[PDB]
Structures are given as structure tokens and as C-alpha cells.
Amino acid sequence: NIQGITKPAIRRLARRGGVKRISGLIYEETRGVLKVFLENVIRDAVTYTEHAKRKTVTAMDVVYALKRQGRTLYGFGG
Amino acid sequence: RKVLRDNIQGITKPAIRRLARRGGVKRISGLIYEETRGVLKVFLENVIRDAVTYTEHAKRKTVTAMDVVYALKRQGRTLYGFGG
Amino acid sequence: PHRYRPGTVALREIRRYQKSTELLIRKLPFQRLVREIAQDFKTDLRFQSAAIGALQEASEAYLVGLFEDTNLCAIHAKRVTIMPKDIQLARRIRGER
Amino acid sequence: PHRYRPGTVALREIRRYQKSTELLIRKLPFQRLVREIAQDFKTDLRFQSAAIGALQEASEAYLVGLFEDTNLCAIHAKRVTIMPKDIQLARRIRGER
Amino acid sequence: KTRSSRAGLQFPVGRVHRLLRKGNYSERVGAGAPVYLAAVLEYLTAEILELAGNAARDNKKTRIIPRHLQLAIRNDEELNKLLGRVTIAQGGVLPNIQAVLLPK
Amino acid sequence: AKTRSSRAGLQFPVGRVHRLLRKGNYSERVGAGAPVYLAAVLEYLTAEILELAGNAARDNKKTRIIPRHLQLAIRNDEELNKLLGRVTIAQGGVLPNIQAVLLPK
Amino acid sequence: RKESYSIYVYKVLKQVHPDTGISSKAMGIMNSFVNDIFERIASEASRLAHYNKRSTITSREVQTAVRLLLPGELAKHAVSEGTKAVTKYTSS
Amino acid sequence: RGRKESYSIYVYKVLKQVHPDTGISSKAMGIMNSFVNDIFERIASEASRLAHYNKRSTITSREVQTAVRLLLPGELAKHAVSEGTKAVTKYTSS
DNA sequence: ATCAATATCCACCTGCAGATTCTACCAAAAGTGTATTTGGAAACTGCTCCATCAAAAGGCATGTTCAGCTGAATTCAGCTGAACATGCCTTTTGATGGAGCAGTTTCCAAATACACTTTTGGTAGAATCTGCAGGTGGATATTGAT
DNA sequence: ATCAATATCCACCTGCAGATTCTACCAAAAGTGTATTTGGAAACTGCTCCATCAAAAGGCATGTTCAGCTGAATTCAGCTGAACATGCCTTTTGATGGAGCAGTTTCCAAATACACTTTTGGTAGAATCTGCAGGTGGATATTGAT
């Protein structure tokens, strides 16, 4: 499923970041980084979910998880 | 008392060199020393400013080590060994 | 018989994507990845659509920022092509490593 | 007359200061610097000795950390000599500026 | 007769007071603290809305969207410093291309 | 008159930790197991650091743990290092580390 | 159930831009902003009171917190607006 | 006058448990006190927040446990959850 | 492949600064007995959340071709490191007055706690509007080429 | 730079329709009044510890010289990654209907908060003990010239 994060999508992200030329090895490096990011955020979110005896990850659980990681997000509950 | 001026230059070239060494730096361009002073001065302004704000809030005239510890903790530079 | 020189369309896409705000990863692949990663932490979970949307916005903002710092590292090395060692240097300075 | 080749004494100093923990900026000059900066912010201040000590330990820990990241930027540029653009790149990626 | 009108504020002093008591910040809450805090929240809100309304005008738009909030924040040195670790969903980034990557 | 630490099987002071929780403006009410659990976690983390630090002290032929030993213990353990990756330990110095590219060819 | 700051944000919007509206996603962002700054100010004032062994958060704490968080500006103007609202409140 | 509390005696006890031959300089003990107070406040405030997000006015060992899992990494967390759970059931055995 | 010059160990010796232990009051844990809740354990709604269908409309995967960027190789001016002479100014030891923290009390302005009344803000079915997204048609920007 | 073609990009105007906006009514806060509580400001004052000052001295800072080798040009070729058009497929979209399940609401028993009385564990000094910081010795590398 990590490979479903396609090369052209990584291209688009890079371009929003101002990147002009991309080495061919960037795509797998990017997938590895994205996966560490999601593991860290989701793990904390699901910890909030379990603490609340629910089976549904809330947007609030993600927002609190992101605020713990120092990635505060506006527009979903806080 | 006596007028304080140009004390940043008391951060000597050999001291900046030593700090570079503890940081593993082998070769130092001649322009590093004045950059370091600039960077150090910003660091100190930000910490002392917060520390003295804690001092003023307590209606004191003496900056305590606790004031510096709280200022550093605000700046995300938590310090152990003066905390109490 | 028309071809733009390499670099021209790339700059054109920088200008386009820095101007829009749409998510750049496709939704469904992303959702599969999120649910798969989640399954290793707790089983048979459900996700509010807004929780998936929040994760995607977080991740895409994170990656775009990381690419900015990576690009700066590549420029620092007198290149214009980002490489893995650029991402690695940025992530190290950032304290993620 | 005996002469060590350039770089040899530098490596000796890296090894030496990486074993030790003593402060590397001279006490009295630093105390004067803190008093000057503080006084240009509020007058009639007094300082606990330990407050100056805390400032120095923080400051030296900060500068040593910054020089590690600086050294990484220099090496990334296939150099060995740290330069001001290295410190600037480090501080930019760190989000200080 | 409300405390906000008495303070001359659009923001709700009474709610800011109930959130301070209920938020586990301190045992007691002074009478002016919710007033003061409400004033600061309304002032910062106004500052952002002003700049974002401007971005909206600058784009031939009458309704402020997230992108206008992003351009307002990132283009102001101080709001940007205050929010340098915050992500504004659907705000995008500022147009910026490094010189070295331009043609010729 | 048993102490709660004794009842809990702990060296750390359960009663004092329970008092720091009520006085700390963390919540209205504090359950009875919260200070026990917290004193337990604090004593375990103290044990783990002191273990590693004592080993550093012995590795450098010393009998008394000083800050430098605390630094080596923390920086050399991946998890204590992550736990304290934003903490500065006064008089701890740094880990001996020289980038390879800087050694003689 | 589920109170918000939307009403008050919209009022302030009409004060500075009577001509201008706001999409609900943007209103969401404004809510996140208000809750965030609220918690920063409140948390710093909490600490301030604790360091000085006091049990009351007063406007004095809130002010020092504002000085500690906003650059100043945006802190000089925040201090202005806060002092102003408190005195207008105490003479009524 | 002006009596101030510490964790020093408890740190020292645990020290004798793990390394009976070894001492600790007061500066290192200073570091240890800062560590205990730091981690205490991280755990306590994360617990404060969990309780708030669930409209619960009580911090129980369940909160303290979720906080420890959110803060400690990996292997330190599994051992801390063990020691804490063990102490709580031993304590509730009067 | 060997001296010589110099730096680096490493172990052995020893009292002094700093630690470990010994002793007495008091703030603070503990015990016991009361009087509030808390938030769980059940039984039930209504949302929202998967699971599928089933079209098409994109957007991605693949192979071609080359432009141009990265990296390797070579040079060399001059920057920066090492070593040295000189002598300043930080350190260290120690003393002194007094600023200004911090510890006790006293005790009013301002806080929390009710109990009652009255208003507001959130909700869910009301009535328009802002822009999206397609239409041109007109310059613009790129890139090849006498 | 200015000839000609291919695409790109930019404005002006257009008409839906998805979201705003404006209108219409009920519990939960918000404001008031009344009665106690109390936190911490004010008024001394005991007593650390901060700011200064004197003085002698040696570790370091400053400046200078000299050239080793580093960084910054310059060149160049192989080959990596950009731009295509071509192809086919997984994402998207949008319901229907089913259901799993967050969120209410009604609980009572376990557990928490009070609140005085009784104990004792810890803190602040004296008192007693001892790692180790330096200081001096010759082993044992380590470097750099031949």
C-alpha cells in the first residue's frame, strides 16, 4: 500500500516545495519518511482512541496526536 | 557604577575555537567568529528577556537561577542541574 | 514537432502547485495506507472521514515542508537535484534523527 | 624544529574537549556580557551567581550543538571548513530563522 | 447587561471565565482575567481577519477562505512567528522559487 | 500505621506524589491508584538511569557518579536519549564523536 | 452541545470588513486559532501563578503571559487592548 | 525556614539498590532531581489532558498509564507499565 | 622501513573539599469517621461509517530520446593552522557593608458558594449569493531556425 | 534580435448549485443578589548573598610569521532524469440499505473528598568519613622527517 503513494504524487509534493530536479532514489526515501510519520501520528491517535473505549479514530484523536508531535493542525476540531 | 560596552568581544576567538572543537569542528573559516558572536547575542537576548520577565512578574530585582530555568524551558532548552 | 527544454515544465509545475491548495496524494491509496498502518496498533478500527482528511493534510504539509529544507540542502551542495542524502541531512538537523 | 602538520593539533583538540566537561568561555567576560544585555533591557538588576552559571551552561551547550549541525552542513558541501553560510543553513533548518 | 458589553468586547467574557475555572489552571480566577484574556483573543482575531480580508480583496474575492488565512499569516513576520509550528489545513504555501533554479 | 509506599512495595514517596498531584492543578479529583502508579514509574526510570550511570562511573574507574556519567548513560541509550533529546545536563559534556571524513587519509 | 467561537469571530469580521464573508472551513481555522492561543495564555498564566506560590490567575498573570508569548508587537497592542477592556469594565 | 523538599533520599535508596558500592555527587543528584520533577510534570499534564478530553474530572491510574504510554518510548514504556500495574495491585491488596 | 621528538597513557601517593552519617523539631503523612459524587454497567436510539455495486473519467505506468547536470580530475592563490614571543586580565582568596529576599502576622477587598431569575447561543428547517469552471479570444512565452 | 509556429496563460463574461445567510424557537449558561471565606497585599524585620574592593600571579589571549593544503575555479563526458505520447486501469463518485456503534439517559455502589486528632518520616543543621584532583615518574604509543 505504501507503493500506492505514487511517483507522480511525490513529484507534485516536491514541486509545491519548490523542487526542480528529483533524483530517482527520492521516491523510496520519501515513502520511508512518510511511513515513519504516519506510524508516529497514528500510534498516538489510536492510543487516544483506546483510552476512550472506542473503536473509531476521531478527527479529534488525530488533532490531539498531531499536537503532541509538535505538528499542530488547524481546521478539524482545534 | 561603570559603563558596559562591547562585552560581546569578550567571547574570544580561542573560546569560540574550543567550542567548535567540542562540537567536532576541525577547520574554521575566519568569518565564523563574528557569526558566532551574533548568534550567541540573539540566544542571550531571548533567554535573558524571558528570565527578567519572570523576575519582574515576582516584583523582584534579582534574577534567580529559577528565572533562567523557566526561561530556558519556555524556549525549549530545558536545563538540568540548577532546577532546585 | 514541439518539445520544452528540461526544467521548463518543472518550473511551470512549481508555479502551479505553489498556487493551489488541493491535496496532491490520491485519497483512496492514502486511506489504504492509513488503515494498514493502524491495523498493527489496534484491530478492526473505524475512521471518521474527517480523521483521514486530518491525517492527509498533516502528512502533505509535513512532506512539502521537508522538501523545502531538502531543496535548501541540495542548493547548499551546489546542486539543483534533491537526493536522499539531502532528506537525511534535513531530518538530522530537524532532530527527527 | 619539530612541526605538526595542519589538522593534527585540531584533531587533538577535538579529542581533548570531547572528553572534558568544563566551560570553555571565560567566566568574567561572560558575566559582563550577560549584565550588558540584561541592562539594555531593564536597569537596576541583580543576578544570583547561579543564574549566571545557568546562562553559561545553557549558552555553551547551545553553541556546541549548533557547531555539530554546522559541521554536518560543511561536510555536506564536500568541505572541512565551517563557514557562515553553514551556520545559517543549520539555523534555518532548525527553525530558528 | 453582560460583562462583555461592559468591557466593550464582542468576545464572551462569561464563557472565557467558565473555561478558566473549568480548565484546571488555578484554584481561584480573578474578576478581570477573563476580561483581559477575552480582549487579547478578540484583538488577535481582528488582526488576522483584517489581513485575510485584504488577501481576499487582492484576489477579487469577497469570502475569506483558508488560503487567505495562510497568505495573511505567512506574509506577516509576527503572526508567522506566533504560528510557526501550526499547519493551516487547505492553506497551501507561499509562491517562492529559489533564484538558482530560474532560467538563463 | 503502614506507609502507602510500603503497601505499594516502593522506595519513592507515594504520599508526597499524591500531594503534588492535588496541588498541581491537574484535575478536580485524584484517584488512589494514580500516585502509586506514578511513583512506581518515577522510581523505575530513576533506577534505569542510575544503573547505566553507575556503569559509566565504573568504566572510568570512579566510585562516585558525577554529571558526566549521567550524560554518557543517557546519550548512549537510544530510549533515554529520545526521552531527553531536548534536555541539557549541566556539566555533562558531549559523546566522543569525530566525523570520519575528518581523520587523516 | 458543542459550543464554538463562530458567532464572535463573525461579529469581529463585520467590524473590520463589513463587506467580507467567511467559508465554514475558514471559520474552523479561526476556531482552532482561538482555542490554541487561549490554551497558551491560560497555561503560561497557570505556571506564573505556581512559580510565585499563588492560587489566583489575575489579569496580572494574563498580561505577563501575553508578554511571554506574543513578539511585541503583536504583544504591545494586546497589552493595550487588555488593559483598556479591564478599566472600561471596572468603572461600570 | 526556609525548608525545601527533594527526592534525594529516595534517589539515594534506589542507587544503593542497583549499585551498592557507588555514591553520587551533589551536582549529579541535582541532575537527578531535575529529571524526576521533569518526568513527573510531563506524566501529570498529559494525564490532565486525557481526563479533560474525556470530560472526566478524575485522574486515575488508567490516565497515568495512558500518559506513560504516550510519553515513554518503546521498551521503557513496557517496563514502566509493568512496574506501575504491579505496584497498584499490590497497593489495593491493602 | 628507522630514529627522534613529543604527546599520551597508566599506576602509585595523599589530605582537603566535598560527601556520608548522626541528631532534633514540625510540617506533613496516616487513621477514622463522616457526607458527596463519579462514572461505570445496562438498554437504546440515530448517525455516520463500511461495503458494494456500476459506470466512465481521468490520472498513472511504460518506453524513447536526449539535454544538461553531476561528479571526477587538475590547478593554484592564499586562507587558515601551528608555533612563538610577550605580557594582560582573569582567577582565586578573602573581607565588608547593605540591598533586598524571605519569613511572620494582621486582616480588608475580592474571591467562592449558593439560590433565583432571565438571557443567549446552539439547533434544525427557512432564503438567497459567491465562485467554480467553461466559454471565448487575445497577447505572451518558448523554442526552433535565413 | 527579431522570423514564425506551438502552446501557454490571461481577461471578460456567463448560470448553476453547493454551500451561505437570514428567519424561527428551547435547556443551559450567564447575570444578580446575599452571605461567608480567604488569599495575599501591607508593614515590619531577620539575615542570605550580591556587588565591590584589594592584591598577587600564572594561565591564557594577542599578534606575528610562515607555508601546507584547502576551497574554488575550470573543464569535460557519461549517463541520469525530463519531456513526450501511448496505453490501459485504479480512483472517484454516488447512492441504497445495513449496521455497528458513539452519545443519551437512568442509575446505585465504590470511591473520592472532607475534617479533625495522632504519628512519624525528612529536613536542616552539627559531626564524622573518604574519593579523587592534581602533582611527579618513567612506560607506550603517535607523528612526521628521511
Side-chain angles (χ1 to χ4, degrees), chain H residues 27-61:
Chain H
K27 281 187 177 189
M29 184 61 81
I31 306 293
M32 288 312 296
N33 257 275
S34 303
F35 173 72
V36 178
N37 292 310
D38 185 355
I39 281 44
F40 181 109
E41 222 274 340
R42 307 199 201 175
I43 307 279
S45 50
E46 191 64 71
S48 182
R49 277 179 243 115
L50 267 166
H52 187 251
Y53 305 159
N54 296 281
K55 314 186 200 306
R56 273 172 163 45
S57 52
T58 319
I59 290 168
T60 69
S61 60

Side-chain angles (χ1 to χ4, degrees), chain D residues 59-71:
Chain D
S59 291
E60 288 198 19
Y62 168 83
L63 285 179
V64 171
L66 189 59
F67 282 122
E68 297 160 9
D69 298 351
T70 302
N71 205 17

Side-chain angles (χ1 to χ4, degrees), chain D residues 3 7 25 35 43 48 64 70 73 79:
Chain D
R3 194 158 185 94
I25 298 170
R35 293 193 197 266
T43 42
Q48 297 193 336
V64 171
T70 302
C73 293
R79 291 182 275 101

Side-chain angles (χ1 to χ4, degrees), chain A residues 1-6 8-26 29-30 33-43 46 49-50 54-60 62-63 66 71 73 76, chain C residues 7 10-11 13-14 17-18 20-22 24-26 29-30 32-34 36-38 41-42 44-48 50-51 53-55 57-64 66-68 71 80-84 87-88 91 94:
Chain A
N1 290 284
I2 195 65
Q3 293 287 330
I5 284 54
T6 64
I10 293 161
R11 298 274 290 214
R12 291 194 290 276
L13 292 158
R15 304 243 175 279
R16 190 170 275 173
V19 170
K20 184 190 192 174
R21 213 161 178 275
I22 301 173
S23 150
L25 294 168
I26 281 290
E29 187 78 27
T30 301
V33 166
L34 195 231
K35 192 194 171 227
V36 171
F37 183 86
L38 289 165
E39 288 172 353
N40 288 345
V41 176
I42 293 177
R43 176 182 298 119
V46 180
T49 311
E50 283 178 86
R54 318 185 312 250
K55 308 254 305 181
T56 312
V57 178
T58 298
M60 277 325 276
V62 173
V63 166
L66 284 165
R71 306 290 319 182
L73 175 70
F76 291 80
Chain C
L11 278 162
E13 308 175 40
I14 290 171
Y17 291 119
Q18 294 197 336
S20 64
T21 64
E22 72 249 10
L24 308 178
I25 305 172
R26 294 178 308 178
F30 188 85
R32 276 197 298 267
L33 184 65
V34 164
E36 165 200 310
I37 287 172
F41 295 132
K42 177 86 166 166
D44 193 24
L45 288 152
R46 301 172 106 84
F47 277 95
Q48 300 196 335
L55 283 167
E57 294 257 0
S59 326
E60 288 201 25
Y62 167 82
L63 285 179
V64 168
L66 184 57
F67 279 125
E68 298 168 18
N71 203 23
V80 308
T81 316
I82 61 166
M83 291 171 195
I87 304 181
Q88 291 162 14
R91 291 193 63 240
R94 279 169 165 224

Side-chain angles (χ1 to χ4, degrees), chain F residues 1-2 4 15 19 29 61:
Chain F
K2 289 282 183 299
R4 286 197 280 168
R19 175 200 102 228
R29 301 157 69 82
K61 304 187 174 169

Side-chain angles (χ1 to χ4, degrees), chain E residues 3 6 10-11 15 18-19 25-28 30 33 35-36 43-44 48 50 62 64 66 78 82 88, chain G residues 3-5 8 11 15 17 20-21 23 40 46 55-57 62-63 73-74 77 79 88-89 92:
Chain E
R3 280 194 280 173
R6 188 172 303 142
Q10 299 294 304
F11 272 45
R15 174 181 293 181
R18 180 249 296 160
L19 296 171
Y25 297 114
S26 57
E27 186 185 337
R28 300 157 133 248
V35 173
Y36 201 118
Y43 163 70
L44 290 170
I48 293 177
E50 172 76 13
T62 89
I64 296 184
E78 286 179 344
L82 183 64
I88 284 182
Chain G
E3 66 190 13
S4 171
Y5 283 113
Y8 316 95
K11 289 175 186 185
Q15 282 193 290
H17 279 87
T20 315
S23 75
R40 310 196 200 174
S46 182
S55 44
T56 320
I57 287 169
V62 165
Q63 173 168 100
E73 301 96 332
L74 216 49
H77 290 171
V79 173
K88 178 171 290 168
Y89 176 84
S92 305

